[PDB]
Amino acid sequence: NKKRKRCGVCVPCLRKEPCGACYNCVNRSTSHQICKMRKCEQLKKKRVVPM
DNA sequence: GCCAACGTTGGC
DNA sequence: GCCAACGTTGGC
Ligand SMILES: [Zn+2]
Ligand SMILES: [Zn+2]
């Protein structure tokens, strides 16, 4: 399998804008990570199978 | 080829 | 167990 996709239906997924104040917003360049308020609740769970 | 952002690792 | 850094890659 490949990388998982956002679920689109949890609160973080339904969020319209980045929060602007978390570690990932402030350091967008070094982290490569989505805003911590936008991270999908499903994707915070570790994979059922590796790649 | 770019870019948003997942997967994995490892330092704490 | 948490979380930042890096390499990566799906979609464009
Ligand atoms: Zn944020
Ligand atoms: Zn979600």
| Closest protein CA to C1' of nucleotide B7, residue | A3
- Strand B: list positions under 7 Å from protein Cβ: 4-8
| Closest protein CA to C1' of nucleotide C7, residue | A32
**CB burial class (10 A; 0-12, 13-18, 19+) of residue A50?**
exposed
Technique employed here was X-ray
Q: How far apart (Å, rounded) are the C-alpha atoms in residues A35 and A27?
A: 10
C-beta of residue A36 within 8 angstroms of C-beta of residue A22: yes
Positive or negative: CA dihedral A19, A22, A28, A34: negative
Q: How far apart (Å, rounded) are the C-alpha atoms in residues A40 and A8?
A: 8
- The angstrom resolution of this structure is 2.0
Nucleotide nearest to A44 (CA to C1'): B6
